[model samples]
Target: TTCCPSIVARSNFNVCRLPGTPEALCATYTGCIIIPGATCPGDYAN
Candidate 1:
């Protein structure tokens, strides 16, 4: 998995997709899982 600055910053951070926020747990076991509304910031790959 690519290392994302935003993802790496939060290990146990998990949240639902808010009205205007990004959904979490999209990365799976990478600790940082942000998806749905936002793109992963890193090598462009999860």
Candidate 2:
């Protein structure tokens, strides 16, 4: 899981992603979840 340089440097980091942002994150044991955007179901995939 690629992560930000700041976090990696600050701590003994291995995992990626952080709080406040989920859309640009890595997969977890729980699995992928849909993060609804401001447009909602306006997108093609939706």
Measured by lDDT, the strongest candidate is: 1
For each candidate, the alpha-carbon lDDT, in order, equals: 0.39, 0.32
**Per-residue lDDT over 1-46 for candidate 1, one digit per residue giving the tens place of the 0 to 100 score:** 3233454344323332233234334344335534454556554333
lDDT of candidate 2 at residue 13, scale 0 to 100 = 25
Model 2 misplaced regions, further than 4 Å: 8-19, 23-46
TM-score of every model versus the real structure: 0.19, 0.16
Q: Give each prediction's root-mean-square deviation over alpha carbons.
A: 8.8, 12.1
Q: Which stretches of candidate 1 lie over 4 Å from their true place?
A: 1-30, 33-37
Task: Report residue 27 deviation for candidate 2 (angstroms).
Answer: 14
- Model 2 per-residue lDDT at 24: 38
TM-score for candidate 2: 0.16
> By TM-score, who's the top model here?
1
Candidate 2 lDDT over 9-33, as tens digits, reads 3232223345523533432422333
